[PDB]
Design a protein around this ligand. Structure first.
Ligand SMILES: Cc1n[nH]c(C)c1S(=O)(=O)N(C)C
Ligand SMILES: [Zn+2]
Length: 140
């Protein structure tokens, strides 16, 4: 599990979005595994605007933050998970690292702030859904 709390927005994995998230829906994209919903309180996280390929991610299934190198946001093919089939996914970044289904939502962060959230796992790879292209997250 895990979310980004930027201003009055909540950024979650589409596949972990709650009824409350869908009832307060701002934006959602199955191809990115992202959903954004409205909050009443302001959040404590800030979003990276950058092309960094190094950062640190939280891995719940190890209670550990790992420094990683990761690919630039891309269109990757993903093998079947407990929560999705084998399929393609967009705006995905890959690193070498541990990712189990429940690690989804872990933040990846660089020197500029939050880069994305864990979205995929398997074969000693962790995939992150990028949020850095979501400039609209900064305002309104
Ligand atoms: C960055 C971006 N904009 N539009 C798409 C599609 C993407 S992508 O990350 O999916 N791509 C580079 C493969
Ligand atoms: Zn950065």
């Amino acid at each position: 599990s895990g979310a980004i709390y930027v201003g009055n927005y909540r950024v979650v994995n589409r596949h972990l979005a709650t009824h409350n998230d869908w009832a307060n829906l701002v934006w959602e994209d199955s191809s990115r595994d992202l959903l954004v919903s409205s909050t009443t309180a302001q959040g404590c996280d800030t979003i990276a605007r950058c092309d960094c390929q190094t950062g640190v991610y939280y891995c719940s299934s190890r209670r550990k933050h790992y420094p990683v190198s990761f690919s630039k946001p891309s269109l990757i093919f993903v093998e079947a998970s407990e929560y999705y089939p084998a399929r393609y996914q967009s705006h995905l970044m890959l690193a070498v690292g541990h990712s189990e289904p429940g690690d989804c939502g872990g933040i990846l962060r660089c020197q500029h702030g939050v880069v994305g959230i864990v979205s995929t796992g398997g074969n000693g790879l962790v995939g992150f859904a990028d949020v850095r292209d979501l400039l609209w997250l900064d305002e309104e």
